């Protein structure tokens, strides 16, 4: 469906596509947040009393602002997630409107078979519900992350600009007696000034902080204790994408060197979509921050990329608040929140 | 050919074939030690008139001993090196005997194309040399041995049985500046009284020791930074076999680990033969060791091995008295010390 209606009924939707095309909105958290306020507003203004055609309705709105963007994620994956917790109530009522027992929480052989009220209300809290989980994640993630972490050992932090991983790492340095060295990269084109950010924040809490330059990965690894990465997109097989510069070869590395990599992961921040090539989900970077003056650019051509994407055969860890999942594992996390059907809007 | 030729001339072969039987001499060194003695005798007693004779009466004689007892590979190579000795001074009296051009220092096509002295004292002067080289070795070593570990480091000590290993770990421990951590490997059957007497030199040298079982080398490999060898012969393509137990379970895991591997033993222990078959090399300890009563140990058949060997392609590092050396190079170290015919007797 076209913008026709939605534009006079919901006003700020087409702020909503500027601040994601033009990039006036940062932070992945912030998007979902726009997301779920957009959401609320389409509920609470519009009347639907049919539900079939308006889970259609919010199928196509969520599927637009998907082709909208192509590397903002966190917005679609909210949709979804409210589309799951419709789509089950719906089910439910079904039931009743009417008027099986599954061996697990789901059936497989269930799709190739042939299978008023206060809705609106349950939709309103599901929301809410949402923003509340949004909120707190670090509440609890932080019981099950502060358990591998050890005295005398050296962890170095690729992508370092997320305010979750920064949390978590100081909540373990609240605890004195767990002893850890902080080697922090720079990341080129997009990360340095968010590294030195990182880097004065850890200095204010006193913690020991080592500035790495990029190409300085091999030297160090040898004496890295436990890799940490701070991942804005988690997909289905294991592989993440990373907010921004040098992650996959230092991974390269660590699988090489035989190195534990943890990563701070969130269940609204997982994506059911799967990433079949490098060529179309690898977003790539300006070379307006590389070097000045464009006549000598004629001939040569400078190769740059923001958002790096990384293979699932290095990393192992996923510190949730629900618990820390395997790479070969977290797409059973998913299901439990995602459909099927849901994937191709 | 058989002992009937020497019987008063020289009689100290029965002793030292006694000594190999029932394993009364003890220690590599002490029976290239007495190799040397024995050939400094038959040189100072016995008559040759002739060259050849002479040689081949040599070959024969060093024959003998190999066939009295395989295991001594120090013994054999002292011989060989005796040799070699000989061989040289011997093709420079032939030139001036008789009264060519060479790329390097030895030839391949002189082998395809057709080619009284005061030699004794030159011979006896070798035997000399070689028992001056035997003295010193760790002198040679520890100016490239303490370069090697560093800081914050943690090394994993396999086999302790090597009396050049302690002394090479003593020097690096002496300095000030330096320092590290030590994890011993037990080794069960042959090695335990020897790591626990390592281990008490090692307290008493007031370092941090770690006395680690057997079973207990997995847990600690995320931190083990280097691995040295107690070996006791080395060969041509760069394998070694190492003084009894323990030892080749732990080189597999460093390999899978990719950690270093380093061995010191000295030029002395290395033999000019190939060692084909492990079976044939590798000698057995004790049933009786292991477990007591005799009646139902017929139905226990134990198996337990002395020495140990491992693959070249998991040690890289080969430091002697001349200087650092791999298993790729070591060949050519043998061939400067054993002539080409000296192989085969």
Redesign the interface.
């Known amino acids: 469906h076209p913008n026709a209606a939605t534009s006079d009924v919901n006003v700020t939707i087409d702020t909503f596509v500027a601040k994601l095309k033009r990039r006036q909105v940062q932070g992945s958290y912030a998007i979902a947040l726009e997301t779920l306020q957009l959401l609320m507003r389409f509920i609470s203004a519009a009347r639907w009393n049919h539900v079939n055609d308006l889970i259609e309705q919010i199928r196509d709105l969520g599927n637009s602002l998907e082709k909208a963007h192509p590397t903002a994620f966190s917005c679609g994956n909210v949709i979804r997630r409210i589309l799951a917790v419709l789509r089950d109530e719906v089910e439910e009522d079904t039931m009743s409107t009417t008027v099986v027992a599954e061996p697990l929480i789901s059936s497989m052989f269930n799709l190739l078979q042939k299978p008023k009220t206060d809705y609106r209300q349950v939709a309103i809290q599901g929301i809410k519900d949402l923003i509340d989980e949004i909120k707190n994640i670090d509440e609890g993630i932080q019981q099950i992350a502060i358990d591998l972490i050890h005295d005398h050992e050296i962890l170095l932090t690729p992508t370092p600009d997320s305010k979750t991983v920064l949390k978590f790492l100081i909540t373990a340095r609240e605890r004195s007696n767990r002893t850890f060295t902080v080697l922090v990269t720079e990341g080129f084109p997009n990360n340095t000034k968010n590294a030195h950010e990182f880097a004065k924040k850890l200095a204010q809490h006193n913690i020991e902080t080592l500035v790495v330059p990029d190409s300085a990965v091999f030297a160090l690894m040898?004496r890295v204790?436990k890799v940490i990465i701070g991942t804005k997109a988690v997909f289905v097989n294991g592989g993440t994408i990373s907010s921004n510069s040098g992650v996959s070869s230092v991974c390269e590395c660590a699988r090489?060197?035989?190195t534990?990599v943890f990563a701070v992961a969130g269940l609204y921040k997982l994506s059911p979509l799967y990433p079949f090539d490098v060529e179309k989900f690898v977003e790539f970077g300006g070379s307006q921050r590389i070097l000045p003056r464009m006549d000598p650019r004629k001939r040569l051509d400078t190769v740059n990329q923001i958002t790096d994407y990384v293979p699932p055969e290095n990393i192992d860890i996923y510190i949730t608040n629900v618990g820390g999942f395997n790479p070969s594992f977290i797409y059973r996390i998913a299901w439990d929140n995602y459909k099927q059907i849901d994937v191709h809007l």
Do not use: W
């Open positions: 040898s204790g090489e060197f035989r534990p």
